Amino acid sequence: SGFKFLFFSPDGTLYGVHNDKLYKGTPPTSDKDNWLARATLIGNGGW
Amino acid sequence: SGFKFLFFSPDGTLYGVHNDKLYKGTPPTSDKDNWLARATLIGNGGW
Amino acid sequence: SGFKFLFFSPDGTLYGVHNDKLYKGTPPTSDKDNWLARATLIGNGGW
Amino acid sequence: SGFKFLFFSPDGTLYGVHNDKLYKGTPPTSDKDNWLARATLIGNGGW
Amino acid sequence: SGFKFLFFSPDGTLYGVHNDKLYKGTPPTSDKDNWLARATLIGNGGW
Ligand SMILES: CC(=O)N[C@@H]1[C@@H](O)[C@H](O)[C@@H](CO)O[C@@H]1O
Ligand SMILES: CC(=O)N[C@@H]1[C@@H](O)[C@H](O)[C@@H](CO)O[C@@H]1O
Ligand SMILES: CC(=O)N[C@@H]1[C@@H](O)[C@H](O)[C@@H](CO)O[C@@H]1O
Ligand SMILES: CC(=O)N[C@@H]1[C@@H](O)[C@H](O)[C@@H](CO)O[C@@H]1O
Ligand SMILES: CC(=O)N[C@@H]1[C@@H](O)[C@H](O)[C@@H](CO)O[C@@H]1O
């Protein structure tokens, strides 16, 4: 629970480290947007 | 109180994590501008 | 003490959170620049 | 273990500090991508 | 003692806070680049 890092790439993609995993995707648009469920998993550990 | 993350997207929108929630909005232009009151809630928790 | 956050906006302005307040201004060019005295107070608390 | 800093350059390259060393490279695109194995070492300590 | 902050400006300059001092410079190109030996000191304390 909670992100360790949460930051943008210069194209506007949101990146986040959550439970040692790395995710990316376009940023959420509302509190109805389950961002983590639709984010792409781009790293399985070590972050 | 207190933000856990406070950062910019490349289009100039300010993003912030406050009390596990995610907020965005144009940055304040003066200390009369209550940013958190006018920011768009874009995540209800898990941040 | 020091800063809680210190980060750039995409237009090149340096932002900083210091003693719960939000500051912005052009980045310092030498150690003779008192950036905190020089920056614009854009938020009086809650940061 | 884990990263101490993880952030983007405006040229699109991902930078990270891991165990006091500095690395850069294209961001990972999947959890098969061993980013730290293929990243360019650009700093052997002090970070 | 490492860096407290390490981040880019949108023109590609790397900024870092180290022992409460603020440094800037082009990012290191390889592990043979002593960045902090050649970085510009732009803040002597308070960071
Ligand atoms: C910090 C880092 O590069 N972690 C990666 C991880 O994301 C990836 O899923 C795994 C693939 O084997 O390799 C590494 O552990
Ligand atoms: C980290 C993350 O994606 N959190 C979101 C939250 O912001 C959103 O309000 C909720 C919708 O049900 O889904 C997830 O919990
Ligand atoms: C986090 C946040 O938006 N803080 C603001 C503060 O910056 C501003 O000076 C004040 C104006 O009334 O309102 C809020 O407290
Ligand atoms: C913080 C910093 O500038 N560290 C560098 C290190 O990355 C580099 O590999 C070394 C070369 O001798 O010099 C310095 O220690
Ligand atoms: C956070 C900040 O602005 N620190 C500066 C420091 O960089 C500068 O060298 C000194 C010179 O007067 O003034 C301030 O203390």
Author numbering:
A (entry chain A), B (entry chain B), C (entry chain E), D (entry chain C), E (entry chain D): 2 to 48
What's written in the study?
Despite their unusual morphology, diffraction data extending to 1.6 Å resolution were collected from the crystals grown in the presence of MgCl2. This structure was solved in space group P1211 with an asymmetric unit comprising two Pent molecules and one sclx8. The calixarene, evident in the unbiased electron density map, is sandwiched between two molecules of Pent arranged as a dimer. This dimer assembles via the concave pockets of each protein, with the Ser2 and Asp21 side chains on each subunit contributing to the Pent–Pent interface. Although the concave pocket is the calixarene binding site, due to steric constraints, only one sclx8 can be accommodated within the Pent dimer. One of the protein–calixarene interfaces is similar to form I, while the “capping” protein has fewer interactions with the calixarene and an ∼2-fold smaller interface area. The calixarene was refined at 60% occupancy and with high B-factors (∼50 Å2 vs ∼30 Å2 for the protein), which may be due to fluxionality of the macrocycle between the two binding sites available in the Pent–Pent dimer. The increased ionic strength of the crystallization conditions in form II (including 50 mM MgCl2 or 0.1 M Bis-Tris) versus form I may have altered the protein–calixarene assembly in favor of protein dimerization. While sclx8 is a well-established host macrocycle in supramolecular chemistry, it behaves as a guest sitting in the host Pent. This hosting action of the protein is emphasized in crystal form II, where a Pent dimer encapsulates one sclx8.
